[PDB]
Amino acid sequence: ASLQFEDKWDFMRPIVLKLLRQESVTKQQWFDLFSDVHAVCLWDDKGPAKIHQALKEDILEFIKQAQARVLSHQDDTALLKAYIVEWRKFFTQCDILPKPFCQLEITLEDSIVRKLMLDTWNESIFSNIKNRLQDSAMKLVHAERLGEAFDSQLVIGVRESYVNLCSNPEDKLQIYRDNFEKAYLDSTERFYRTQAPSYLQQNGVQNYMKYADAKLKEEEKRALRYLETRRECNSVEALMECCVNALVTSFKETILAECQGMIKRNETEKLHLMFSLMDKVPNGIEPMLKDLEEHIISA
Amino acid sequence: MENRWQVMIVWQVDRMRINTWKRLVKHHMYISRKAKDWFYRHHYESTNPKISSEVHIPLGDAKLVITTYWGLHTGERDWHLGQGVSIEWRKKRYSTQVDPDLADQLIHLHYFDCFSESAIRNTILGRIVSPRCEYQAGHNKVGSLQYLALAALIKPKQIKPPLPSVRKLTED
Amino acid sequence: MDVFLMIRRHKTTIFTDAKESSTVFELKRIVEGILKRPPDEQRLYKDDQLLDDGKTLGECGFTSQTARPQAPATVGLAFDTFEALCIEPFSSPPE
Amino acid sequence: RVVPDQRSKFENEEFFRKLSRECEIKYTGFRDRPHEERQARFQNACRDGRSEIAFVATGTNLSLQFFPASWREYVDLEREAGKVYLKAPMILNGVCVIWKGWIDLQRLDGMGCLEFDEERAQQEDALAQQAFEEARRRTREFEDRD
Amino acid sequence: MYVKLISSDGHEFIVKREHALTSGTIKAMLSGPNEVNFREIPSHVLSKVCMYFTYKVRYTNSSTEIPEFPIAPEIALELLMAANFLD
Ligand SMILES: [Zn+2]
Numbered sequence: 001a002s003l004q005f006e007d008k009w010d011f012m013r014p015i016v017l018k019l020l021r022q023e024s025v026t027k028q029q030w031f032d033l034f035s036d037v038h039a040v041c042l043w044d045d046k047g048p049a050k051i052h053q054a055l056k057e058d059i060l061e062f063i064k065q066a067q068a069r070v071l072s073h074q075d076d077t078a079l080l081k082a083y084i085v086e087w088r089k090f091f092t093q094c095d096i097l098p099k100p101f102c103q104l105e106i107t108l109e110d111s112i113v114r115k116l117m118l119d120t121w122n123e124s125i126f127s128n129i130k131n132r133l134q135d136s137a138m139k140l141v142h143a144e145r146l147g148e149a150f151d152s153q154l155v156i157g158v159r160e161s162y163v164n165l166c167s168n169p170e171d172k173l174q175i176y177r178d179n180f181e182k183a184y185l186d187s188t189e190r191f192y193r194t195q196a197p198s199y200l201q202q203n204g205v206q207n208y209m210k211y212a213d214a215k216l217k218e219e220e221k222r223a224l225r226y227l228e229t230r231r232e233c234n235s236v237e238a239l240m241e242c243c244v245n246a247l248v249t250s251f252k253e254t255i256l257a258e259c260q261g262m263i264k265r266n267e268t269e270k271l272h273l274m275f276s277l278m279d280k281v282p283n284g285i286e287p288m289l290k291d292l293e294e295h296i297i298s299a
Numbered sequence: 300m301e302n303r304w305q306v307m308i309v310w311q312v313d314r315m316r317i318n319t320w321k322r323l324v325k326h327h328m329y330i331s332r333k334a335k336d337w338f339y340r341h342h343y344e345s346t347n348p349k350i351s352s353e354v355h356i357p358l359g360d361a362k363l364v365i366t367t368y369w370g371l372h373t374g375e376r377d378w379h380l381g382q383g384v385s386i387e388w389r390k391k392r393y394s395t396q397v398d399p400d401l402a403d404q405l406i407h408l409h410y411f412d413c414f415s416e417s418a419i420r421n422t423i424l425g426r427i428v429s430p431r432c433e434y435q436a437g438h439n440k441v442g443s444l445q446y447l448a449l450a451a452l453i454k455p456k457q458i459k460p461p462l463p464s465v466r467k468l469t470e471d
Numbered sequence: 472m473d474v475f476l477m478i479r480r481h482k483t484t485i486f487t488d489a490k491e492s493s494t495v496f497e498l499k500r501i502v503e504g505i506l507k508r509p510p511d512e513q514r515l516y517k518d519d520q521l522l523d524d525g526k527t528l529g530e531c532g533f534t535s536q537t538a539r540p541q542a543p544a545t546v547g548l549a550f551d552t553f554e555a556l557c558i559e560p561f562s563s564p565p566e
Numbered sequence: 567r568v569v570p571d572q573r574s575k576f577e578n579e580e581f582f583r584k585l586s587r588e589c590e591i592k593y594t595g596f597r598d599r600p601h602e603e604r605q606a607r608f609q610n611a612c613r614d615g616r617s618e619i620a621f622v623a624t625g626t627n628l629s630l631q632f633f634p635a636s637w638r639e640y641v642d643l644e645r646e647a648g649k650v651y652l653k654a655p656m657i658l659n660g661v662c663v664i665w666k667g668w669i670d671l672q673r674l675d676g677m678g679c680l681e682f683d684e685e686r687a688q689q690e691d692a693l694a695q696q697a698f699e700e701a702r703r704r705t706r707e708f709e710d711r712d
Numbered sequence: 713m714y715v716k717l718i719s720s721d722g723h724e725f726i727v728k729r730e731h732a733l734t735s736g737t738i739k740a741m742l743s744g745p746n747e748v749n750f751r752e753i754p755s756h757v758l759s760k761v762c763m764y765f766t767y768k769v770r771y772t773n774s775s776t777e778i779p780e781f782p783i784a785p786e787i788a789l790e791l792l793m794a795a796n797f798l799d
Contacts, residue, residue: 001424030745034737035752038797042423099740302615303635306654311627347637349618361697372594372620373629383629388701393694395657398581400775407706417712423793437706440778441771444764444795446707447781451788469627475766477759483724486731486762505714505726540766541781561756562721564786580774 004044009054012036016055019097020062022089034100041107048107055101059117063124066090070125080136083129084157091160094118122165133158134180138187141226145191145218155226163228173233181235184227185242188219192246200251205258209273212247219243244280252281260291307366308396309383310469311374317351317367317382323463324354333411333462342369351382354463358409361390363402365465384468399469400439407437411462414453419445422452431456436464474528474538478502478515480548482559488540491529495522502548514549516556568695569687572661576682581659584626585680591667593674594620601674608674612641612650621652621667621678630654630665648672655683660698662686716747717762719755731765735798753794760791761798 015033018025040047066086073079098113105111126133137158140150162176192215200208223236248255255274262270271288278284312320327334340353351367368382375381386402388395397405407413411434418428432438433456438446461467478485478498485505489498499510515522522531538544549556576582595604611617619632619641632641632654643650646668654665662685667678687695715732717725733739741748750758764781771778783791 025745027745028749031741031749032751034741035797038737042420042796096744099743102737102740302641304619304632304639304641305635305637306630306632306639306656308656308658309629309631311629347633349631349633349637358701361694361701368631371629371631372596372618373622373631374594376597388698390694390697391691393691393698395660395698398659401659401702404705405701408701408704408709413706413710414708415710415712416708419708419792419796423789423796432707440705440775441768441781443707444761444799445792448783448788448792448795451783451785452792482722484726484759486725486727486766488766539779540770541763541779543763543766559723561723561759562719562754564756564790578773580776583774584776 001043003039005040005047005050008036008040009051012040013054013058016058016097017062019100020059020093022093030100037100038103041103048104051101051104052108052112055104055113056116056120059120060124063117063120067125070129076132077136077139079129080133080154080158083125083133084154086125087157087161088153090117090121091164118165119167122167126161126165130161130179133161134183137180138183141184141187141222142191144222152225159226159228163231173228173231176228177235181227181238185239188239188242189246192243193250196247196250200254205255206270208251209255209270209277213273213277215247216240216243248277248284249281252278252284256287259288260295263291263295307385309368309371309373309385310399311371311381311383312367312468313471314379314381316468317384320367320463320468321352323460326460327462333458356406356410358388358405361388363388363397363405365402384465386465399465402465403436404439406465407434410434411437412456413437414449419449422449428453433458434462434464436462436466472535474533474535475540475543476533476538476546477543478546478548479558480550481557486543489528491527491533491535493528494524495526495528495531496524498528498546499524508550512550512553514553514556516547516549517544519556568692568699569684571699572687573682573684575659576661576663576680582661582663582680585665588677588679589623589625591621591669591676591678592624593669593676594622595674604674605672609643609650609671612643621669621676623678643671652676652678655686657686657690660695660702662690715742717758718747718749719753719758720751721755723755723758725758725762727762727765731762731769734765734768735761737798752797754790756787757790757794760787761794764795 098111101113162180223239338355351369354365356363366385370380371382386397412430413432421428435455475488616634621630640653648671652667662683664683669676767781
């Protein structure tokens with residue numbers, strides 16, 4: 001019954017710090033830590049709010065050192081590399097650090113501790129740089145579409161920040177949806193609104209379809225790597241719909257005129273593609289059908 | 300248009316078991332403070348001929364009804380025909396029957412005195428504790444090691460005459 | 472009807488269970504699964520009395536009536552050839 | 567995902583394990599009366615409006631009483647002659663169930679069991695069903711505050 | 713499948729992982745940096761603790777006949793503390 005928080009915390013404190021940092025920690029350290037936090041909470045009346053406040057302070061101090069390290073870079077893109085680099089560790093830490101603080105939870109998903117980390121991180125580092133980080137990402141995707149190949153981790157990390165850092169309980173993905181998704185989408189609509197009418201005039205309609213089916217293949221993959229999957233969100237379907245609207249629907253009339261013709265010329269490989277593309281357009285399939293019965297009338 | 304039925308699950312009791320249960324409830328509601336907010340409904344207010352009695356015990360917004368039975372056709376060759384109990388948890392035209400164990404656990408959430416969150420820590424610190432659990436009937440499943448541990452140390456309060464427990468009605 | 476066991480050798484002890492219908496050999500194989508030593512080196516006892524490999528657990532005088540999860544029966548084990556059966560008692564509570 | 571939670575207690579829980587077993591049931595009548603009378607009083611009590619019917623699992627201390635509604639239910643003898651069939655939708659410890667069985671008109675011997683009823687659970691309600699689960703879930707120790 | 717929990721008095725205990733996961737504290741300690749070391753709790757404690765682990769896993773699933781896990785009054789305070797730490 002001799003030790004309450006004043007004696008103990010100085011033993012606990014360095015270990016919070018190793019854990020915040022990814023610096024190595026031995027099994028008996030971790031166990032001893034567990035024992036220490038618990039003893040502090042059982043024995044001291046002021047003990048737990050005290051563990052909370054000291055925690056809050058130490059987490060800020062290191063988040064701040066982290067910020068120190070990110071914000072030094074003047075370049076718009078070269079900063080991001082360091083951000084991503086700091087982030088992978090920090091996020092893994094958010095899984096690792098709160099666990100010894102379980103009695104802290106019982107004494108008073110979202111631990112107050114994990115919530116606290118991500119929050120402190122949101123106010124301290126991310127909010128200032130976020131527009132910038134996002135912008136660099138749009139440039140990165142733009143680069144990949146044009147064939148410049150790069151490290152996926154950067155785009156993903158920025159998106160992860162947007163998904164995991166969100167504050168409000170009522171909608172978890174709201175801010176992710178309203179910025180990263182909106183911008184990636186607008187990017188898509190304008191990129192393909194520019195590029196699309198061109199390839200058609202160059203390569204012709206039949207080849208246009210072969211090119212379009214393909215761009216759909218390209219982008220659905222790309223959404224899968226870069227976009228939020230794990231939470232089973234609506235995003236990919238929206239990106240996909242948006243692209244289909246761009247690649248197929250805008251041209252829907254011009255394409256369809258070929259159909260009856262290709263029915264007469266008996267080109268099946270072509271019709272498969274027509275139907276495949278159109279199948280996504282909601283009303284897209286029916287005119288091919290009417291065209292077909294109309295051809296069945298005369299044979 | 301056809302005969303409609305309402306159907307109940309009924310646990311059996313030996314006749315003396317009912318009398319004990321009845322005297323205990325009436326005793327604790329009216330003759331002591333503990334069970335007063337409970338309601339006891341006699342045999343004559345009840346529209347069903349088979350209903351020996353009922354105890355309506357409010358738990359918050361939903362209420363528990365414990366129904367005792369008469370002149371029933373299960374369990375005996377005797378002239379009075381023998382009888383049983385059933386229990387239901389009712390809120391806003393919703394019903395569930397409830398078994399005796401859960402009945403008691405549920406009653407206990409809302410009624411008699413127990414340990415508070417302070418009690419388990421204070422026991423450790425030597426700060427002592429109030430109050431103590433009465434109504435052992437309220438704890439069923441298995442138990443948190445902590446609860447049971449505490450239980451080795453603090454035996455339950457032991458009221459006389461004992462507070463009503465449905466498991467005691469349905470025992471044997 | 473399962474019976475529950477602590478197999479206790481030296482300081483180390485194992486919590487496990489088996490059917491009244493299990494044979495001592497089967498258990499020696501399981502102990503092999505845990506401590507990784509083959510079922511020769513092991514010698515299994517009930518008290519000071521050795522257990523026959525081909526005999527069933529209920530037939531060693533272990534019944535589910537005797538061994539309960541709440542209060543398991545102790546077994547004990549022996550390990551270049553053999554060492555005497557040694558079972559290290561648990562710490563005693565102070566006065 | 568409210569009903570899969572409901573179903574699972576019906577599937578794994580012991581309470582439902584014993585009752586889902588296809589146990590064998592008897593009708594308890596006026597046992598004092600002889601067999602012929604009993605066959606007759608029983609068939610009447612089914613065909614006529616007002617009598618409570620009692621069926622016991624033979625392996626338990628537990629019983630089923632069909633009370634006349636006057637105090638989806640059915641007791642139906644039209645399905646197969648020389649028999650009476652029984653359907654009892656209930657709700658037991660917060661799971662909606664249906665007990666089905668049949669009774670041999672001659673023997674006054676029969677069969678019955680519990681099957682899970684998804685319909686009631688899809689239909690019943692959100693707030694009330696949930697409230698039951700919330701409450702059934704908790705236990706008193708340590709809830710009260712200091 | 714199995715994990716091993718150690719007593720101060722140097723005793724070793726081997727129990728099924730799913731049995732151990734009854735302890736929420738132990739559920740946390742196993743994360744990251746198997747086998748686990750307990751300082752404050754003696755052997756006559758960790759034994760008894762393993763006993764409750766099994767007792768719980770057994771009788772929680774099927775409520776038909778459930779017996780009184782036995783605890784002796786002197787072991788009781790030390791046990792309570794140990795339970796408060798682990799659970
Ligand atoms: Zn209590």
